[PDB]
Design a protein around this ligand. Structure first.
Ligand SMILES: CC(=O)SCCNC(=O)CCNC(=O)[C@H](O)C(C)(C)COP(=O)(O)OP(=O)(O)OC[C@H]1O[C@@H](n2cnc3c(N)ncnc32)[C@H](O)[C@@H]1OP(=O)(O)O
Ligand SMILES: CC(=O)SCCNC(=O)CCNC(=O)[C@H](O)C(C)(C)COP(=O)(O)OP(=O)(O)OC[C@H]1O[C@@H](n2cnc3c(N)ncnc32)[C@H](O)[C@@H]1OP(=O)(O)O
Ligand SMILES: CC(=O)SCCNC(=O)CCNC(=O)[C@H](O)C(C)(C)COP(=O)(O)OP(=O)(O)OC[C@H]1O[C@@H](n2cnc3c(N)ncnc32)[C@H](O)[C@@H]1OP(=O)(O)O
Ligand SMILES: [Cl-]
Ligand SMILES: [Cl-]
Lengths: 206, 209, 209
């Protein structure tokens, strides 16, 4: 009936991602009890058979909320710049035999490290989301998001940056997500804190 | 249960619609794999047997994405201009005996030809969407949309027009969705192009004589 | 296995809430045929066993549309002011021992009386909504809403006040939702009307000193 056993269940991406065209880092998870399905069906219209289509890549340590949507397959065959958006080429009717293929790639959808995707946000094809970003709930993300940026609304718009500029530089330098597991245990208390200038030296001195 | 067998499955509306108050043109289709239900349950609160309610009318060659919503039954009995929006008339309670019917109709929801309605868009009661319009995904459409206009956001607002004013007028005179099917089969390459000028000249030489 | 019988079936909240941390007033009803589930699953991430968590309080005579969402559990353990939004504390992996709890409560979500919550609206944690308010369909409510204020969009913003300042203060003072049943029953016509001042003057004469 329901993939998730409880509303607070958070199952890792790699544990449930079966689509070969979906690339997830470890520890990233999706908690979708309230929509009933595994992460595969958050990723819409991604052919598992082909290697010419746009791919979805998600980094490590991401948190994805229930009913988030990753729209793939570009324009789905609709060319708004042609006379008609109706996709003749893909409809079965002999009257449509001379139709042209309106499908166009958008590029891959790139989801960086440590990014928080709010429940029921929708990510449009070919969006790039930088490290440490926050997509508010119900956002409709139509443009790239810069690292540690917070966006929300429909369409998604700049709300704020999580940290100061020199602080974002510091975090993208050490890139804590790339560290070995034995190392993470030790800086955990600094990670669960605001002391950005602080942890910048424990990585630097070592 | 999923009505559709694959995400790319798109069934013509006239194959799945059962509600006598839903009127759909040829070739229009709904691809609702990701919301499970067939197109009927896209049309919310439409009494299927009464003949005195707002109807949903959809033209031909329309593309409707998954979980699109068409809100019917007007204000559903809720009067914001009355002291309370609670619909006393429609709740079973002997103390609500002298309530008044707050139900108000909005008029038909009319979607024209060659309209693209994005996934999970919500159309409010009484909205008219003209030919060739595009409703971005997740739009909440609260007022009418002109021909060949693109709108999005919540509430939906103008994004752009697909073509120049002259070209829009040209397309509406041609009304290719109404052409004989032989003309449509012959024009299929032009229709999958931006060449309005050429196709309009080709139509005139066929239809002006 | 839908919980509601027809699209028009609105079931009183007090007849379908099991979470001890959801408290509902009389006559308030949820109308959720098009999302299938009972009202409990509208209220998300609300621990039902604990009493140190944010609670949901809903006045009487509220109308709640299908698939409305009430976000509880505050920030869910994600602290945007910490270096990482990833909730180490709640991740069960062995590496994450010296993790710290990032959960922060938002305070109770409070819905006054006579509130109309449009379908598929989402109320954020800790939000208070005053009596007589209207939340438009698909609203994302991030801020408090005043009595008899109409809001909508994502995030929700002021649209209008339903009535004048005088009329609103009259309504908050007379508090018709708290009236004995017999007063409610005999005022049913006035309530299905816009004559606040007239009702106010009657309420004064029946209730003063
Ligand atoms: C929960 C989060 C962390 C995902 C987002 O909330 P925060 O980033 O903590 O928002 P914060 O409380 O710092 O700031 C409030 C602002 O965020 C905006 N905001 C918060 N959540 C959302 C949302 N889901 N959609 C749109 N805007 C939002 C509010 O509109 C508000 O803007 P203001 O500057 O007009 O007040
Ligand atoms: C279900 N019920 C319905 O569909 C009903 O038609 C209703 C009650 C939702 C209609 O809402 P009402 O508040 O009664 O409409 P009313 O005519 O008073 O308000 C019109 C204004 O509300 C705004 N509005 C209406 N619905 C929405 C919405 N979902 N989101 C944002 N704004 C909205 C309109 O933009 C308009 O203002 P504007 O012209 O300045 O932009
Ligand atoms: N099913 C579906 O997925 C249907 C989806 N339909 C679509 O959204 C189409 O792909 C469209 C509308 C993007 C096609 O239009 P295009 O001309 O390709 O859009 P283009 O990128 O040129 O438009 C730029 C503007 O449209 C806005 N936009 C694009 N999609 C959306 C959307 N779903 N909701 C709101 N705004 C949108 C962009 O934010 C930008 O607006 P801004 O400059 O005010 O920020
Ligand atoms: Cl929205
Ligand atoms: Cl939605």
């Amino acid at each position: 009936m329901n993939f998730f056993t409880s509303p607070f269940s958070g199952i890792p991406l790699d544990q449930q991602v079966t689509n070969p065209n979906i690339i997830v880092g470890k520890h990233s998870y999706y908690s979708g009890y309230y929509h009933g399905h595994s992460f595969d069906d958050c990723v819409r219209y991604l052919h598992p058979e082909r290697d010419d289509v746009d791919k979805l890549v998600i980094g490590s340590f991401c948190s994805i909320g229930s009913g988030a949507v990753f729209m793939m397959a570009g324009n789905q065959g609709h060319r708004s710049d042609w006379i008609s958006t109706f996709p003749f080429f893909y409809q079965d009717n002999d009257n449509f035999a001379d139709a042209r293929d309106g499908f166009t790639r958008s590029g891959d959808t790139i989801i960086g490290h440590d990014v928080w995707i709010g429940t029921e946000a929708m990510i449009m094809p070919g969006v790039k989301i930088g490290h440490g970003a926050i997509i508010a709930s119900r956002s409709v993300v139509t443009k790239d998001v810069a690292p540690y940026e917070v966006v929300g609304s429909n369409p998604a718009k700049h709300i704020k940056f999580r940290f100061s500029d020199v602080e974002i530089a510091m975090l993208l330098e050490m890139a804590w997500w790339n560290w070995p597991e034995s190392w993470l245990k030790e800086s955990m208390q600094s990670l669960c804190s605001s002391d950005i200038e602080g942890l910048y030296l424990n990585w630097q001195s070592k």
